[PDB]
Write a protein that binds this ligand. Structure first.
Ligand SMILES: OC[C@H]1O[C@H](O[C@H]2[C@H](O)[C@@H](O)[C@@H](O[C@H]3[C@H](O)[C@@H](O)[C@@H](O[C@H]4[C@H](O)[C@@H](O)[C@@H](O[C@H]5[C@H](O)[C@@H](O)[C@@H](O[C@H]6[C@H](O)[C@@H](O)[C@@H](O[C@H]7[C@H](O)[C@@H](O)[C@@H](O[C@H]8[C@H](O)[C@@H](O)[C@@H](O[C@H]9[C@H](O)[C@@H](O)[C@@H](O)O[C@@H]9CO)O[C@@H]8CO)O[C@@H]7CO)O[C@@H]6CO)O[C@@H]5CO)O[C@@H]4CO)O[C@@H]3CO)O[C@@H]2CO)[C@H](O)[C@@H](O)[C@@H]1O
Ligand SMILES: OC[C@H]1O[C@H](O[C@H]2[C@H](O)[C@@H](O)[C@@H](O[C@H]3[C@H](O)[C@@H](O)[C@@H](O[C@H]4[C@H](O)[C@@H](O)[C@@H](O)O[C@@H]4CO)O[C@@H]3CO)O[C@@H]2CO)[C@H](O)[C@@H](O)[C@@H]1O
Ligand SMILES: OC[C@H]1O[C@H](O[C@H]2[C@H](O)[C@@H](O)[C@@H](O[C@H]3[C@H](O)[C@@H](O)[C@@H](O[C@H]4[C@H](O)[C@@H](O)[C@@H](O)O[C@@H]4CO)O[C@@H]3CO)O[C@@H]2CO)[C@H](O)[C@@H](O)[C@@H]1O
Ligand SMILES: OC[C@H]1O[C@H](O[C@H]2[C@H](O)[C@@H](O)[C@@H](O)O[C@@H]2CO)[C@H](O)[C@@H](O)[C@@H]1O
Ligand SMILES: [Ca+2]
Ligand SMILES: [Ca+2]
Length: 686
């Protein structure tokens, strides 16, 4: 199959995700509706169950609503079993309608449906070329009070019906008991509870194994991707081990939720996306989009800076999931606002780099404030809205024009209100023009592009007041008027002669695992695959076609390798960096160093004899380590993904910037567990 096939679970760049709040989409099976005080059929009480379910989604998939829009992927509420409690908050009744209050990761939420219902959903979707993504929140269970066990379900955790433990009397330490987070620091947000939710302790062996076993179940059920909840609130090392588990079994496209506020640019966030084994929801993109197109707090210059900065900050920018709003933000469309604002933002997102995600109902001009006002029941299934049509015309471009899916981004024309950008991949090109100024047209002269000579019709058909583009030799466009609030899309596709890599997935795994390499001009005959300088050919290359290659990772030493391919004739392609070859199966180990004093601004890091520990290279050391919550300074701790059953040598370091102070004496030594977790505790050697 080609790169665009529904079967491609490793790449979503050619797709368009539709974010569904299951309960608020469509109640296709009233028989499974919750009853009494936990339900409101009218969906007037936004905190109770409204009845939306999997059967409903199936119906919507079957009746053309999503397909007619060009949607090729869906992201649904967490499917696992949630508590049944009806909680009274501020005099208001609340339910688990959102799917975030888990009780059993190996069962389904009966309100959504049964396992059989789930299987059917998967089948229905696939039959319509729609990939299925599930929300997964292994960071906590549900609302609890250690002092008052009768409150809710006491964050109880079950294993396929078998009780493991609750928040009260947590002798095994399945959960964290450090109060609630205040988001003052990263460490703080990880080792403390979100709201009143029972925080899961991933260092607990039972929890580790269980969670890993659970995801396997869902993978076995046929999912195509995973949306990881609050990744900024779980230990990074643990998550890396989780991704390894997934990748070394059945790799699927995974992206996490790492919230960013307005004007917020985080290096920690970049690093996580670059080395965790998963990508992230593009908050930087989303926030900038709202500023420029919605709240008028920034202009095109800021939009361009975000695009350029992001492309450099993210090793795999094309893996970031873009959006303009979500279940945790106020709806993009303001009641009294000009609809063109939303239309423009949509078009921008659909034609930009990454993986676009659209929050259900956006296309219906839904308005609403923060939770739960942004989660009303979809008021219509009309295909006649302008927004619907915008998506309908642009979504498919992601499939047919690889420039949109894998291309670079380049500004071609700009002013306070206008932005004209170009996407390019091999012989493929796409040019988009946006004039956010709703009252003034712009006179466009001097525009230069990569489009061949000719005339180009607006892909939007003038829907957003766009126009035809005339390109002479040299890619120079003839003078034209860009209507007030105008938006136009011009594109070109053609055969690519030379092998071009547009995407690789997964990006982190152990030898023997099969990876997917997508792009154009690979040819039909098996060529050669390079991992760094190492060449792979023949048998290990499972399949080879023009747009996609399937190959087994070679048994090279653990480390980072750049990927390249060559056609059967020996022609090399571009290089796709940052591939991570693991040393083997991974386990999550907690490292604790005692009595490591430092000066303000100086932190402790971990280094060692394996790739996972940076192979003694301080620049690749793990950290900075933590010293407030679990353990207190001068004792430091950190959770790390290491190779199972291996004997590892390690040392600690103290660093100020890139300046490094090595721990004295001899190296510490330990043997990693074969499965489950472990905690290594030593004293800093002077
Ligand atoms: O020994 C004494 C005592 O100790 C112990 O008690 C302590 C507790 O153990 C401890 O946890 C602590 O609890 C208290 C809280 O600390 C305190 O805040 C207060 O909590 C209140 C809330 O204030 C109040 O609002 C309400 O909360 C309701 C909500 O109103 C309601 O909306 C609903 O929310 C749920 C959502 O609907 C649902 O979707 C889901 O949300 C998801 C979200 O959808 C998902 O995408 C993801 O989002 C996160 C994101 O990951 C994260 O980054 C973050 O984003 C922030 C950014 O990072 C920041 O930069 C900045 O921008 O801000 C944003 C947003 O904050 O947040 C996103 C979510 O907003 O993740 C979400 C979670 O999966 O789930 C939502 C939560 O359920 O439902 C909640 C109810 O849960 O009510 C709570 C509780 O009353 O009060 C708590 C109780 O006091 O402190 C206790 C005392 O010290 C012992 O237990 C006790 O016995 C002992 O006596
Ligand atoms: O907002 C998050 C903060 O996180 C980071 O802070 C780090 C420091 O950079 C580390 O050096 C370390 O801090 C130690 C400190 O090294 C140690 O001396 C001691 O600090 C004393 C301090 O010497 C003294 O002058 C006085 O201020 O009292 C302090 C309390 O002991 O203990 C510190 C830890 O408590 O660890 C912190 C993280 O905990 C980041 O670099 C900061 O910018 C940021 O504030
Ligand atoms: O190149 C392959 C080599 O790899 C392995 O060597 C590792 C060591 O095992 C680590 O311990 C570490 O070495 C540190 C050392 O721990 C640290 O003390 C420091 O050494 C100073 C020393 O403190 C000082 O007294 C004086 O002796 O100078 C030394 C500096 O040279 O710095 C070392 C790092 O430079 O890292 C090395 C890899 O760099 C393996 O064990 C070796 O057998 C192998 O050759
Ligand atoms: O001609 C190449 C030139 O095109 C663009 O410059 C625009 C500029 O953005 C407008 O504000 C206005 O001044 O017209 C110029 C074209 O004459 C690119 O921005 C620029 O990099 C490029 O050199
Ligand atoms: Ca139902
Ligand atoms: Ca946590």
């Amino acid at each position: 199959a080609p790169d665009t096939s529904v079967s491609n679970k490793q790449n979503f760049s050619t797709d368009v995700i539709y974010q569904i709040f299951t309960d608020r989409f469509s109640d296709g099976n009233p028989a499974n509706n919750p009853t009494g005080a936990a339900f409101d059929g009218t969906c007037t009480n936004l905190r109770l169950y409204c009845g939306g379910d999997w059967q409903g989604i199936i119906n919507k998939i079957n009746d053309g609503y999503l397909t007619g829009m060009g949607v090729t992927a869906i992201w649904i509420s967490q499917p696992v079993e949630n508590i049944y409690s009806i909680i009274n908050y501020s005099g208001v009744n609340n339910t688990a309608y959102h799917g975030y209050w888990a009780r059993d990761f190996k069962k389904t939420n009966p309100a959504y449906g049964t396992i059989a219902d789930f299987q059917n959903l998967i089948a229905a979707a696939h039959a319509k070329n729609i990939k299925v993504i599930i929300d997964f929140a292994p960071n906590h269970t549900s609302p609890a009070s250690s002092d008052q066990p009768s409150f809710a379900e006491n964050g109880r955790l079950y294993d396929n019906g078998t009780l493991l433990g609750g928040y009260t009397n947590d002798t095994q330490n399945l959960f964290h008991h450090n109060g609630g987070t205040d988001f003052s620091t990263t460490e703080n947000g990880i080792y403390k509870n979100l709201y009143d939710l029972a925080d899961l302790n991933h260092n607990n062996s039972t929890v580790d194994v269980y969670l890993k076993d659970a995801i396997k179940m869902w993978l076995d059920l046929g999912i195509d991707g995973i949306r990881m909840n609050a990744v900024k609130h779980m230990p990074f090392g643990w998550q890396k081990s989780f991704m390894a588990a997934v990748n070394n079994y059945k790799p699927v496209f995974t992206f996490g939720q790492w919230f960013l506020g307005v004007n917020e640019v985080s290096p920690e966030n970049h690093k996580f996306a670059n080395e965790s084994g998963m990508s992230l929801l593009d908050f930087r993109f989303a926030q900038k989009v709202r500023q420029v197109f919605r709240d008028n707090t920034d202009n095109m210059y800021g939009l361009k800076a975000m695009l350029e900065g992001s492309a450099a900050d993210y090793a795999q920018v094309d893996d970031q999931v873009t959006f303009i709003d979500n279940h945790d933000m106020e709806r993009f469309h303001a009641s009294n606002a000009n609809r063109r604002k939303l239309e423009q933002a949509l078009a921008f997102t659909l034609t930009s780099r990454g993986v676009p995600a659209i929050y259900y109902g956006t296309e219906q001009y839904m308005s609403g404030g923060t939770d739960p006002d942004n989660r009303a029941r979809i008021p219509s299934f009309s295909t006649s809205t302008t927004a619907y049509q915008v998506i309908q015309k642009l979504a498919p471009l992601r499939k047919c024009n690889p420039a949109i899916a894998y291309g670079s981004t380049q500004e071609r024309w700009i002013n306070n209100d206008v932005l004209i950008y170009e996407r390019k991949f091999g012989s493929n090109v796409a040019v988009v023009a946006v004039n956010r100024n709703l009252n003034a047209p712009a006179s466009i002269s001097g525009l230069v592009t990569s489009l061949p000579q000719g005339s180009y019709n607006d892909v939007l058909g003038g829907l957003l007041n766009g126009n035809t583009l005339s390109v002479g030799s040299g890619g120079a466009a003839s003078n034209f008027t860009l209507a007030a609030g105008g938006t136009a899309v011009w594109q070109y596709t053609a055969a690519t002669a030379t092998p071009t890599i547009g995407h690789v997935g997964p990006m982190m795994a152990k030898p023997g695992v099969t990876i997917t390499i997508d792009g154009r001009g690979f040819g039909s005959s098996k060529g050669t695959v390079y991992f760094g300088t190492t060449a792979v050919s023949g048998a290990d290359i499972t399949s080879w076609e023009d747009t996609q290659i399937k190959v087994k990772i070679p048994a090279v030493a653990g480390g980072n390798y750049n990927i390249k391919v060559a056609n059967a004739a020996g022609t090399a392609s571009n290089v796709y960096d940052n591939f991570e070859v693991l040393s083997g199966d991974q386990v999550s180990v907690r490292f604790v160093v005692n009595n490591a004093t430092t000066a303000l601004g100086q932190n402790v890091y971990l280094t060692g004899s394996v790739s996972e520990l940076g192979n003694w290279d301080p620049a690749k050391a793990i950290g900075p380590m933590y010293n407030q919550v679990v353990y207190q300074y001068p004792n430091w701790y950190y959770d790390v993904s290491v190779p199972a059953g291996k004997t590892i040598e390690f040392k600690f370091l103290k660093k100020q910037g890139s300046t490094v102070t090595w721990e004295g004496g001899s190296n510490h030594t330990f043997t990693a567990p074969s499965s489950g977790t472990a905690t290594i505790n030593v004293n800093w050697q002077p």
